[PDB]
Amino acid sequence: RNSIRYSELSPLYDTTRLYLVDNKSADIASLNYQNDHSNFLTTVVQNNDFTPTE
Amino acid sequence: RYSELSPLYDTTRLYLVDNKSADIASLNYQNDHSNFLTTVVQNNDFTPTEASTQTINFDERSRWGGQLKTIMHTNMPNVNEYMFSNKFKARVMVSRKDILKYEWFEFILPEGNFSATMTIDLMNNAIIDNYLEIGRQNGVLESDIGVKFDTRNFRLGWDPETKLIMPGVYTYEAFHPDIV
Amino acid sequence: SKSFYNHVFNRFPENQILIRPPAPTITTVSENVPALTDHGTLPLRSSIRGVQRVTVTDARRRTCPYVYKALGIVAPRVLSSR
Amino acid sequence: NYLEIGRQNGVLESDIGVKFDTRNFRLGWDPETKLIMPGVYTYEAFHPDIVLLPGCGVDFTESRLSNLLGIRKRHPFQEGFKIMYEDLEGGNIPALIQPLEKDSKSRSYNVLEDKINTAYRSWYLSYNYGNPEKGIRSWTLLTTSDVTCGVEQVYWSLPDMMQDPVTFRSTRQVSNYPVVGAELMPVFSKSFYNHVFNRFPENQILIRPPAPTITTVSENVPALTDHGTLPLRSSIRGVQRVTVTDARRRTCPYVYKALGIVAPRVLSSR
C-alpha cells in the first residue's frame, strides 16, 4: 500500500510486437557501414532517448 | 519488462516552479509571481495543456502527507503606495487677516527606498510645498507654518534661575524623532 | 532593518526653530533577504492533477506585487493506513 | 556610439537622447512661476531613472539590466519590454522671470514654447506625477534595485545513484536528466553606507548622476544544503555522474566546488 503511479505509464501483459527494420536512420550511420541488406544489424529498442550504441 | 523502466515506492519529490518555458507562454499571460499556474508533470512529450488532464496517484489504501519547503525573494521599497507608507494628514493655516483660518489636507511623498532621516526631510518638504501654493499668497508669514518634524531635545541647556536657554542656540544633537 | 554608524532641504538656515534637523549617529535602512522555510508535514490529496495553482497573500488577503521569485518542494510519505 | 556615428553626421552634444540618471527633477518647483527656482536641479539620489528625447527609446526584451534599475512590468509573463518617448506622457522635466535657454558652453537645453517645460521626459516623473490611469504607472512597477540582476534556482542530478522521481523519463541527454534537488544559486546582495565618466560638467541635464548613500554589491557565499531522503538503486556502479544545471537546463561554468554525501538506510520490506 505504498506505490506511486503516473497516469501515462502502464505495464504490459500476454503479447506485443517486435520490429526488425533495415533502414532506421541512426542505425545506418553507426552500425552498418560495411554491411548490405542480406546481412545487417538493427535495434529492436524503439525509444529515441538513446543512441543505438547505448 | 523493459530494463529502462521501474515502478516507484515510499517517497518521491514534486517541484512547483514559476519559470518553466512552456508554462510562461500558454498559462500565465495575465498573472504575476504572487499568483500563477504551473505544471507538476516534468515530461516534455506533452504540452502543458495536454498535461492538465493527467494525474499522479498515491495508493488509496494509505493516507499520505507532504513535507513542504519554500523559497521566496522580494524587492519591496520602504516608501510606497500599496502599503500605505506614502501619505499622512495634517491641519495647517490657510489665511491670516487678525482672524486665522485652518484646514485639513492630505500630503503625498514620492516612492523609493529611503533612510529614516531622508524620509523626515521629505515630510517637511511636503508641508512647505503647501505653504507655497496656498498660504503665502493669502498673507501667512514664514513664521506661522505650524507643523515641523524634528529630532532635537529642546530645553537641554536650560537654567533653573533665568529659565532661558543660556547658550542662545538649542543643542544641535539628535535624540528621537519629534513633532512640533 | 540594518544599522550603520556615521539647499531645498534647508530653506530657513537662520531660524533656530526651522533649521534642518541634525542627523542621528545611527542610521537604519531596510533590506530584502531571501527566505528559506520549512513548514512541516500536511495531509495530501490522493489524486493530484497535472496543473497546480500557487498563491501568496498578505494579512488583508491581497496578493503582493513585490514578490518576484517563489518555489515549492514537496516530499510525500505515508502517514497511516486506510 | 555618438563619437563613432552621429557626431560626424551633424548631431550636436545637445540631442543625445538617452541617459540613465538618479535624480528627482522638479524637487524645487514653484507653483506660481512653474520653474525650478534655485536654478539647479537638486543633486540627491532617489531611484534609478530613464531620460528620453523625442524619437528615442530603450528595449529590455533580451536583457536582465531592468532588474538592476528597479523597473519591472506588472504583467511579467507577457513577452516584450519597450519604453518609448510616447509612453512617458506627463513626465516633462521643468525648465530652469524667464527660463534659461542655454548652458555655460552654449549648449541648448531644448526649451519649448510656453517657456516652462523642456523636451526631456523621465520615467520617474511620469510614474509619480503623471496620470495614474493612463501614464507609465498603469503597467510598470517601481522596486528596489537588485545588484545581482535576479538570481534563479539550480538543479542537482545523480542519474546512476537515485531512482527517477515521478513523471521524469529515463534518458542520456544532459539537458533532460531527472532532477533530485533544488536550491537558489548562492549569490547575494550586501549593503554599505557611504574624467571619462563626466564629459559635460556644465550641463545640468548631462551632469554625472549623484551616488546613493546606500551602495550594494554582490557576493558568493558557500551553500550547505540538506535535501532529505530519496529512494536508492539496489546496485550501484563504481563510477558515478554528477551534474548541476540552471533553470534553462544549461550547465553553469561558475561552479568550482561541488561535493555530495549520501547516507543509506532501509525504508521498507520487499
Residue numbers in the entry:
A (entry chain WA): 48 to 101
B (entry chain D): 52 to 148, 171 to 253
C (entry chain D): 456 to 461, 478 to 553
D (entry chain Y): 203 to 298, 364 to 461, 478 to 553
Sentences reproduced from the published study:
To test our concept that a selected ADDobody can be reconnected with a jelly-roll fold multimerization domain to yield ultra-high affinity ADDomer-based super-binders, we set out to graft ADDobody-AH0, derived from human adenovirus Ad3, onto the jelly-roll fold of the chimpanzee adenovirus serotype Y25 PBP to create a chimeric ADDomer, called Chimera, displaying 60 copies of AH0. This Chimera AH0 nanoparticle was produced using baculovirus/insect cell expression and purified by SEC and ion-exchange chromatography to homogeneity. After two-dimensional and three-dimensional (3D) classification and 3D refinement with applying icosahedral symmetry, we obtained a 2.2 Å resolution structure from 377,978 particles, resulting in the highest resolution for any ADDomer-derived nanoparticle structure to date. The overlay of the ADDomer Ad3 jelly-roll fold and the chimpanzee jelly-roll fold domain in our cryo-EM structure reveal a virtually identical fold, with an RMSD of 0.49 Å and differences only found in the N-terminal region of the jelly-roll. In the structure of the Chimera nanoparticle, the N-terminal regions comprising residues G47 to L59 of adjacent PBPs are observed to undergo strand swapping, stabilizing the interaction between pentons. In contrast, in our previous cryo-EM structure of the Ad3 ADDomer, we observed a hairpin conformation of the N-terminal residues, and the interaction between the N-termini was stabilized by hydrogen bonds between S61 and the main chain of E59. Y53 can interact with N94 and Q105, further stabilizing the penton-penton interface. Chimera AH0 was passed at concentrations ranging from 0.325 to 1 nM over immobilized ADAH11, revealing strikingly low dissociation kinetics and an estimated avidity in the picomolar range (~200 pM).
Adenovirus-derived nanoparticles (ADDomer) comprise 60 copies of adenovirus penton base protein (PBP).
